[PDB]
C-alpha cells in the first residue's frame, strides 16, 4: 500500500508523474514567434486583393453566398501551410521499426508537392501506434488471416441486426469478455465510430456528463450528439472533479432545479498528448461516494498497461467490475482496425438493440477479426507476452534517459508515449525536417491541437524497438537538442 | 483557443514588453518631440486594443463549436463570457496607466488632453459589462 491520501484512493505503487512548468524566458519568445507570424498573414492576405495558387471557387455559374469564412482559414494557410511537409509523409512499407518513406518536395513552398522517385529506407519511426509490435507481414500471427481472407472475403455487405453476422463475430465478442474479465463484449467497425454512436444511446435529455479537459474528438462528439449537459473538469484534478461532482447533486439543472436523471464520467486511460495516466483509484473511490457512473476509454491503455497488458485496471490491480463500461480499440496495440465495448450483460444486450451501428452501419471485415484473435492468443498464450516486459523496460529506460539529458518530458514516467516539448513555432518546422535528415521520422504536434505554449513533439515507444534501435535514436537526438538549444529543463 | 489565450502563462509579461518595445522604437525618431511620443503611443495602443478586441470576430482557426462565437468579437468571448475575471481587469487597468503616464508627460496640455482622452474613452466604453452584445448600427 502506497497512498491512501485523502479521497480513499488506495495506491499500491509510487505514482511519479512530472508536469514541469515552462520557463519564463522561453514562454515570452513564443508569442514573439507567433506575433511575427500573425503579422505577415494580414500582409499576405492583403496582397491577395489582386490576381501559392489557390483552389479557386467556380466562377462559371456560381458566386452565391461564399462558402468558407476567409478568417477561419487563417491559421491553416499562414502557420500550417508553411510547414506542412511533415506529419503527412506517405510510407510504403510495413510500419514496424524501420519504415520505407516515399520522398516528396515542393518548389511551390509547400503549396503543391511532388514525389521524385525516392524511397528513403530503414527509417526508424517513433510515431506509429505499434506498441506490441504486431505490424509485420511475417510470422504465423498474420498468416492465419490469409486462410481467413481466401475463405471469407473482405467485408460483409450487410448489418449486424440484418443478415451480416458471422461466427467469427460471435467468437470475438466472447473472446474479449474473457480477456477483459467482464461479462460480455461487442466489437464495432472503427474506434472513432464507437463513441460517436453508443454514448448517445446511453445518456438522454436529463443527463449530465463530466468529461476531462482533453479527451479526444470521439468523446466530445458523442457528448454533443446526445442532448445532454456537458461540464468540464481539470485534467487529473480530483479536487476540481469533486467540486463539480458536489455541486452537480446539490443543484440540478440551471433552469429548473429538478434532480439529474443520471450522471456519468468520460475519462481515458492514457491521454495521447501529454502521455499520462488518470488517477484511477481516486476516481473509483469518488464515484462510489456520489453514485455516479463511469465510462472508461482504454484506447491507448490496453496492451500497454498491467503485466500481460490488460489496460489500466490490472495496472492498478483493481477489478473490472467497478467500471461501468469499458471501451478500447484494436488499432493501437494490435495492428488491426476497430474497437469494442466491454460491460455487464444487461448493458451489452441493451446496446445490441439500441446501437446506431449494429442497426445501420456495416460490421467488421472478416480477416481483420482474425488478426485481432491471433494477437490476443499470443497475449493469452509466437511473439507473445514477453514483449510487454520488454516495452516497459524500453519505457522506463527511455524515460529516464531523456530526462537526464536536459530535455523536458511530461506525463507519468511509465507511460509509453513520450511528449517532447518544443515551444517555438519555427522549432516545430525545423525539427521534423531535422530528424528526417538523421534517418528518423517523428510526429510533431501543432498549435491549435495544443495550447499556445505546448507545441510539442511526441514519441511512440514500441516493444519492436530493441536496445540498439533505441540507443541509435538517442544518439541522433543528442545532436539536435543541442542544435536547436531545446534543453529547457533545469535538471 | 481564444478563450484561454490571455489566461495563459506570461502573456501579461509579454504584453508589456510589446508596448515597451513600441515606445523605445517611437523614442528614437529624429523629427519628433518627447511630449508627442507619449501622445503617439497612447493613440496607437488604444487603436490596437480596439481592433484586436472589439472589431474582429470569430477565430483565426476553425472552432469545433460549429461557429458559436462567429458573431462575437474577441473581448466578448474571453473565458466563455464571464466578465469579472482575473484577466479582463488586467486589460482595463493597463490603458489607465497608459493614460496617466501620458497625463504626466506632455505637461497636462489641452490638446494632449483632448486627443489622449477619446482614445482612452473609446476603448473602455465597449468594456462595460452591460455593453456585452449591443452593436452600434453595424458589425
Amino acid at each position: 500500500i502506497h497512498h491512501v491520501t485523502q479521497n480513499g484512493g488506495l495506491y499500491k505503487r509510487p505514482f511519479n508523474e512530472a508536469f514541469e512548468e515552462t520557463p519564463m524566458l522561453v514562454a515570452v519568445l513564443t508569442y514573439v514567434g507567433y506575433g511575427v507570424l500573425t503579422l505577415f498573414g494580414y500582409l499576405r492576405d492583403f496582397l491577395r486583393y489582386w490576381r501559392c495558387h489557390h483552389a479557386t471557387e467556380r466562377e462559371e455559374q456560381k458566386d452565391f453566398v461564399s462558402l468558407y469564412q476567409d478568417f477561419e482559414n487563417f491559421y491553416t494557410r499562414n502557420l500550417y501551410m508553411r510547414i506542412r511537409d511533415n506529419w503527412n509523409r506517405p510510407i510504403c512499407s510495413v510500419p514496424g521499426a524501420r519504415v520505407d518513406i516515399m520522398e516528396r518536395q515542393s518548389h511551390d513552398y509547400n503549396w503543391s508537392f511532388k514525389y521524385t522517385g525516392n524511397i528513403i529506407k530503414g527509417v526508424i519511426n517513433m510515431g506509429s501506434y505499434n506498441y506490441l509490435g504486431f505490424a509485420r507481414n511475417t510470422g504465423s500471427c498474420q498468416e492465419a488471416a490469409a486462410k481467413v481472407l481466401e475463405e471469407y472475403g473482405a467485408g460483409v455487405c450487410s448489418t449486424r441486426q440484418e443478415i451480416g453476422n458471422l461466427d467469427k463475430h460471435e467468437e470475438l465478442e466472447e473472446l474479449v469478455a474473457r480477456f477483459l474479465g467482464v461479462e460480455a463484449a461487442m466489437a464495432y467497425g472503427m474506434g472513432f465510430a464507437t463513441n460517436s454512436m453508443n454514448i448517445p444511446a446511453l445518456v438522454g435529455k436529463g443527463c449530465l456528463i463530466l468529461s476531462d479537459e482533453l479527451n479526444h474528438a470521439s468523446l466530445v462528439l458523442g457528448a454533443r450528439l446526445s442532448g445532454a449537459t456537458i461540464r468540464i473538469f481539470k485534467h487529473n484534478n480530483m479536487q476540481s472533479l469533486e467540486k463539480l461532482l458536489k455541486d452537480a447533486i446539490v443543484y440540478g439543472q440551471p433552469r429548473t432545479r429538478r434532480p439529474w436523471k443520471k450522471i456519468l464520467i468520460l475519462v481515458e486511460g492514457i491521454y495521447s498528448m501529454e502521455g499520462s495516466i488518470v488517477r484511477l483509484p481516486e476516481v473509483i473511490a469518488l464515484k462510489k461516494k456520489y453514485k455516479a457512473y463511469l465510462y472508461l476509454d482504454e484506447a491507448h491503455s490496453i496492451g500497454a498497461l498491467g503485466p500481460t497488458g490488460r489496460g489500466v485496471v490490472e495496472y492498478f490491480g483493481l477489478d473490472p467490475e467497478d467500471v461501468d463500461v469499458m471501451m478500447g480499440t484494436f488499432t493501437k496495440s494490435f495492428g488491426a482496425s476497430g474497437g469494442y465495448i466491454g460491460g455487464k450483460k444487461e448493458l451489452i444486450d441493451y446496446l445490441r438493440t439500441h446501437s446506431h451501428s449494429a442497426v445501420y452501419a456495416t460490421s467488421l471485415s472478416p480477416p481483420v477479426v482474425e488478426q485481432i484473435i491471433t494477437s490476443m492468443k499470443c497475449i493469452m498464450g509466437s511473439l507473445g507476452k514477453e514483449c510487454v516486459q520488454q516495452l516497459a523496460e524500453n519505457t522506463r529506460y527511455f524515460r529516464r534517459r531523456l530526462k537526464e539529458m536536459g530535455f523536458i518530458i511530461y506525463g507519468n514516467e511509465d507511460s509509453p508515449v513520450v511528449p517532447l516539448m518544443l515551444y517555438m513555432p519555427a522549432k516545430i518546422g525545423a525539427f521534423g525536417r531535422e530528424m528526417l535528415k538523421r534517418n528518423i521520422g517523428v510526429v510533431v504536434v501543432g498549435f491549435p491541437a495544443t495550447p499556445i505554449i505546448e507545441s510539442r513533439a511526441r514519441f511512440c515507444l514500441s516493444a519492436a524497438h530493441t536496445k540498439e534501435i533505441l540507443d541509435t535514436a538517442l544518439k541522433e537526438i543528442d545532436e539536435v537538442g543541442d542544435l536547436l538549444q531545446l534543453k529547457y529543463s533545469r535538471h | 483557443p481564444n478563450t484561454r489565450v490571455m489566461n495563459s502563462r506570461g502573456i501579461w509579461l509579454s504584453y508589456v514588453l510589446a508596448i515597451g518595445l513600441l515606445h523605445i522604437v517611437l523614442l528614437s525618431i529624429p523629427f519628433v518631440s518627447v511630449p508627442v511620443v507619449w501622445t503617439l503611443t497612447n493613440l496607437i495602443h488604444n487603436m490596437g486594443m480596439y481592433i484586436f478586441l472589439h472589431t474582429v470576430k470569430g477565430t483565426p482557426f476553425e472552432t469545433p463549436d460549429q461557429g458559436k462565437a462567429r458573431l462575437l468579437t474577441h473581448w466578448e468571448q474571453m473565458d466563455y463570457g464571464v466578465q469579472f475575471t482575473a484577466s479582463r481587469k488586467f486589460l482595463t487597468i493597463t490603458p489607465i496607466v497608459l493614460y496617466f503616464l501620458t497625463s504626466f508627460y506632455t505637461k497636462y496640455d489641452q490638446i494632449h488632453f483632448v486627443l489622449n482622452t477619446v482614445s482612452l474613452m473609446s476603448v473602455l466604453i465597449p468594456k462595460l459589462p452591460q455593453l456585452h452584445g449591443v452593436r452600434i448600427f453595424g458589425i
Partner: peptide, 29 residues
C-alpha cells in the same frame, strides 16, 4: 504645475473607477 483645471476632476473619476472595478469578483423560465 500642481493643477490643470478640469483634468484632475476627470483624473479623479478614473482613479476612483478602479476601486469599484477591483472588487466585483464574479459575473454571470
Amino acid at each position: 504645475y500642481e493643477a490643470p483645471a478640469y483634468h484632475l476632476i476627470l483624473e479623479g473619476i478614473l482613479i476612483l473607477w478602479i476601486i469599484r472595478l477591483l472588487f466585483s469578483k464574479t459575473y454571470k423560465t
